[PDB]
Design an enzyme around this catalytic site. Sequence first.
Site, PDB file in Angstrom:
ATOM      1  N   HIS A  62       0.829  -1.206   0.000  1.00 20.32           N
ATOM      2  CA  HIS A  62       0.000   0.000   0.000  1.00 20.32           C
ATOM      3  C   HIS A  62       0.863   1.255   0.000  1.00 20.32           C
ATOM      4  O   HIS A  62       0.562   2.220  -0.715  1.00 20.32           O
ATOM      5  CB  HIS A  62      -0.963   0.020   1.192  1.00 20.32           C
ATOM      6  CG  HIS A  62      -1.885  -1.154   1.253  1.00 20.32           C
ATOM      7  ND1 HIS A  62      -2.637  -1.440   2.371  1.00 20.32           N
ATOM      8  CD2 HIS A  62      -2.190  -2.109   0.337  1.00 20.32           C
ATOM      9  CE1 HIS A  62      -3.345  -2.539   2.153  1.00 20.32           C
ATOM     10  NE2 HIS A  62      -3.083  -2.971   0.931  1.00 20.32           N
ATOM     11  N   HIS A 110      -9.433  -1.637  -4.715  1.00 22.24           N
ATOM     12  CA  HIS A 110      -8.290  -1.932  -3.857  1.00 22.24           C
ATOM     13  C   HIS A 110      -7.360  -2.941  -4.513  1.00 22.24           C
ATOM     14  O   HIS A 110      -6.133  -2.865  -4.346  1.00 22.24           O
ATOM     15  CB  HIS A 110      -8.716  -2.457  -2.492  1.00 22.24           C
ATOM     16  CG  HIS A 110      -7.541  -2.715  -1.605  1.00 22.24           C
ATOM     17  ND1 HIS A 110      -6.922  -1.708  -0.900  1.00 22.24           N
ATOM     18  CD2 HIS A 110      -6.801  -3.835  -1.403  1.00 22.24           C
ATOM     19  CE1 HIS A 110      -5.878  -2.210  -0.254  1.00 22.24           C
ATOM     20  NE2 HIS A 110      -5.776  -3.493  -0.555  1.00 22.24           N
ATOM     21  N   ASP A 167      -3.412  -2.501  -4.966  1.00 15.59           N
ATOM     22  CA  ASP A 167      -2.409  -3.527  -4.664  1.00 15.59           C
ATOM     23  C   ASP A 167      -1.540  -3.832  -5.877  1.00 15.59           C
ATOM     24  O   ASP A 167      -0.318  -3.995  -5.753  1.00 15.59           O
ATOM     25  CB  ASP A 167      -3.092  -4.817  -4.198  1.00 15.59           C
ATOM     26  CG  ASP A 167      -3.480  -4.785  -2.737  1.00 15.59           C
ATOM     27  OD1 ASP A 167      -3.014  -3.897  -1.975  1.00 15.59           O
ATOM     28  OD2 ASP A 167      -4.273  -5.659  -2.345  1.00 15.59           O
ATOM     29  N   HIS A 224      -0.712 -11.088  -4.837  1.00 12.35           N
ATOM     30  CA  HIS A 224       0.701 -10.720  -4.723  1.00 12.35           C
ATOM     31  C   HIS A 224       1.615 -11.775  -5.322  1.00 12.35           C
ATOM     32  O   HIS A 224       2.602 -11.439  -5.981  1.00 12.35           O
ATOM     33  CB  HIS A 224       1.079 -10.479  -3.264  1.00 12.35           C
ATOM     34  CG  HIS A 224       0.128  -9.576  -2.550  1.00 12.35           C
ATOM     35  ND1 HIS A 224      -0.073  -8.265  -2.929  1.00 12.35           N
ATOM     36  CD2 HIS A 224      -0.702  -9.801  -1.505  1.00 12.35           C
ATOM     37  CE1 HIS A 224      -0.973  -7.714  -2.129  1.00 12.35           C
ATOM     38  NE2 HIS A 224      -1.371  -8.626  -1.258  1.00 12.35           N
TER      39      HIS A 224
HETATM   40  C1  LIG Z   1      -7.412  -8.086   0.329  1.00 13.83           C
HETATM   41  C2  LIG Z   1      -6.111  -8.883   0.352  1.00 13.83           C
HETATM   42  C3  LIG Z   1      -5.451  -8.797  -1.023  1.00 13.83           C
HETATM   43  C4  LIG Z   1      -5.147  -8.357   1.429  1.00 13.83           C
HETATM   44  N1  LIG Z   1      -5.822  -8.073   2.686  1.00 13.83           N
HETATM   45  C5  LIG Z   1      -5.649  -8.850   3.753  1.00 13.83           C
HETATM   46  O1  LIG Z   1      -4.776  -9.710   3.783  1.00 13.83           O
HETATM   47  C6  LIG Z   1      -6.536  -8.673   4.946  1.00 13.83           C
HETATM   48  C7  LIG Z   1      -7.150  -7.450   5.188  1.00 13.83           C
HETATM   49  C8  LIG Z   1      -7.965  -7.283   6.298  1.00 13.83           C
HETATM   50  C9  LIG Z   1      -8.173  -8.352   7.185  1.00 13.83           C
HETATM   51  C10 LIG Z   1      -8.883  -8.121   8.237  1.00 13.83           C
HETATM   52  C11 LIG Z   1      -9.544  -7.923   9.202  1.00 13.83           C
HETATM   53  C12 LIG Z   1     -10.442  -7.806  10.241  1.00 13.83           C
HETATM   54  C13 LIG Z   1     -11.227  -7.761  11.122  1.00 13.83           C
HETATM   55  C14 LIG Z   1     -12.177  -7.608  12.241  1.00 13.83           C
HETATM   56  C15 LIG Z   1     -11.534  -7.916  13.590  1.00 13.83           C
HETATM   57  O2  LIG Z   1     -11.107  -9.290  13.640  1.00 13.83           O
HETATM   58  C16 LIG Z   1      -7.562  -9.565   6.950  1.00 13.83           C
HETATM   59  C17 LIG Z   1      -6.742  -9.736   5.823  1.00 13.83           C
HETATM   60  C18 LIG Z   1      -4.433  -7.102   0.960  1.00 13.83           C
HETATM   61  O3  LIG Z   1      -5.057  -6.053   0.840  1.00 13.83           O
HETATM   62  N2  LIG Z   1      -3.117  -7.185   0.727  1.00 13.83           N
HETATM   63  O4  LIG Z   1      -2.418  -6.080   0.206  1.00 13.83           O
HETATM   64  S1  LIG Z   1      -6.459 -10.530   0.509  1.00 13.83           S
HETATM   65  C19 LIG Z   1      -7.004 -11.046   1.973  1.00 13.83           C
HETATM   66  O5  LIG Z   1      -7.467 -10.832  -0.469  1.00 13.83           O
HETATM   67  O6  LIG Z   1      -5.267 -11.284   0.231  1.00 13.83           O
HETATM   68 MG   LIG Z   2      -4.016  -4.548  -0.215  1.00 12.65          MG
END
Ligand SMILES: CC(C)([C@H](NC(=O)c1ccc(C#CC#CCCO)cc1)C(=O)NO)S(C)(=O)=O
Ligand SMILES: [Mg+2]
EC number: 3.5.1.108
Length: 299
Positions: free
Chosen positions: A82, A237, A241, A264
């Site tokens: 990010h 998003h 990424d 990724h």
């Molecule tokens: C979207 C992704 C590409 C990746 N994001 C994550 O890994 C991610 C993000 C947020 C949470 C959370 C929370 C909570 C709560 C509530 C309390 O427990 C968990 C995981 C990313 O943005 N990477 O840059 S993903 C998963 O699709 O791989």
């Molecule tokens: Mg991300």
Amino acid sequence: HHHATIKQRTLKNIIRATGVGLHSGEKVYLTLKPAPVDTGIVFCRTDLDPVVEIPARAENVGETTMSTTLVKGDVKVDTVEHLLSAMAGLGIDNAYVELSASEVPIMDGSAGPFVFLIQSAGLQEQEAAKKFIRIKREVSVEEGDKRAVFVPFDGFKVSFEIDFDHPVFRTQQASVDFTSFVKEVSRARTFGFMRDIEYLRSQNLALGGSVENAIVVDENRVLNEDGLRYEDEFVKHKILDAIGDLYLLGNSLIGEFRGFKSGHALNNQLLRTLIADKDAWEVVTFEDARTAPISYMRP
Ligand SMILES: CC(C)([C@H](NC(=O)c1ccc(C#CC#CCCO)cc1)C(=O)NO)S(C)(=O)=O
Ligand SMILES: [Mg+2]
């Protein structure tokens, strides 16, 4: 009145921020500093003695589970994508990123806070031409039904399509021609599904995640009280990424990226295949901003 080279950029002033790592939950202090021409973006673990410095380059990418991680020996810097997206979107070539812990702070889950802090500090043009990686041939990687492609294009454009079996989408697809970064995608937050959280936390992942820094989705609804920033925030998003993962090439891109359920790991596989295929790209500069296919905000 004359030709004007597009120049490398760094920060005009230091930026300081404090936060928490999305996956580790650790408190981390962040300092962005200007850097000389041709430095690139370099992450520096200042909690270590001696300080360990890791250039943000494809060859230093270790794991790609949940986030993009940089590795050097036993030392890692987690979740760089990010912040790198913000650097790429604003055209920052050179900077030192000092971190007091192994993970970049998540902030609000988007690149918004980073672009605000950077633009408040301001950018500084430097006395050297900006180098671009121009895509000359189509380069594609697939694994199963996931796919990531570079295509020649006179400009910079990113398309992405995701397919989540989930009511909250009621397929998400978006194409952005860099419209521009701060407006189009910078504010799009990361997201997580509650069905994954207990498993993830059991694996020391998502330990810092909360509605304050992510879209949290249950079986049917977004749980965040104030909802979404964009109707298509999720795929926006994914594009954010991708822009940060692509900046691990170390230069801005002249070309098109197309992602189909990519993430990724496959993004980094695409960069490695591209770098190996020297027929497919070249490094170019522009001595006259007026005839270049890219333009940048005022510094
Ligand atoms: C979207 C992704 C590409 C990746 N994001 C994550 O890994 C991610 C993000 C947020 C949470 C959370 C929370 C909570 C709560 C509530 C309390 O427990 C968990 C995981 C990313 O943005 N990477 O840059 S993903 C998963 O699709 O791989
Ligand atoms: Mg991300």
